[PDB]
Amino acid sequence: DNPIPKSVPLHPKSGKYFHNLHARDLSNIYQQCYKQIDETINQLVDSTSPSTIGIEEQVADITSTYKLLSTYESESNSFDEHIKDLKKNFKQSSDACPQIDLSTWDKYRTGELTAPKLSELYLNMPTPEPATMVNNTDTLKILKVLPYIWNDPTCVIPDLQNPADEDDLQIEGGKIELTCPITCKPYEAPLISRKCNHVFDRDGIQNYLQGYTTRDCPQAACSQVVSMRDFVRDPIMELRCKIAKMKESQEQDK
């Protein structure tokens, strides 16, 4: 009866096999999926036939697969975390078990000694969802805003730190300017600050901070001490200007 034990510890010769256990990396593929996603909004924005429909449909579809892909990714990241933990726990538990020998073998078979069984520990992993954070991915904000800026490149968008939040935007009144506050000319290389949401054209702060270490933010000298590193590229503002330039272009030739 029970000729073979329920489990035995990790054998020294199985060290390399255990070590190599891991879920196949998909980082490179996910990366390309997101890049493929991006390149699609670009051509969408850059080649969609004259507005008066906005693009609310197109955006809905794209955001639907974007979120899907993102849901998949989080599960994958979670999967690795669980595999790694479960393995680390197995190894430590396995290392406290006596090696197999003429006496030990009967004990593992009878139950006196019990070794950890990785296959069972694997089947019985957490399995929660999402278990991560609703990361504010740059590409998600563009999707959220896009339909609004398409029909009105100046519409005042209010605060959004948690996009993907199926809800309408608190579109304020008036309209923002597609012109750099340090050139008074329409943008051409918008840059947004990280510690404050002020956007200046590249040559704006490029020359404003030129020769200085950390000058206060130009806008009303906004307290925030800034530097070139604090200025990212503004996809949203570039989208606005991109759209305005297309509207002006479509106003003359349509």
């Binding site: 593929i29 493929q36 390149e39 051509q43 080649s47």
Partner: protein
Amino acid sequence: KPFANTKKTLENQVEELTEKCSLKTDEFLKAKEKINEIFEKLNTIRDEVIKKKNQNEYYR
């Protein structure tokens, strides 16, 4: 001895699992290839758009 038979059944199961892993590997690499074909179709379509565009840029 008293092990000969079980051990035989054990050696075979390991042989079967080994071929299984080999199959799932090829199945996995196959799926990877399928998605790359889609990255490819997406890329070519984009090229078409870029070209149809440049054509209209020229007005014809």
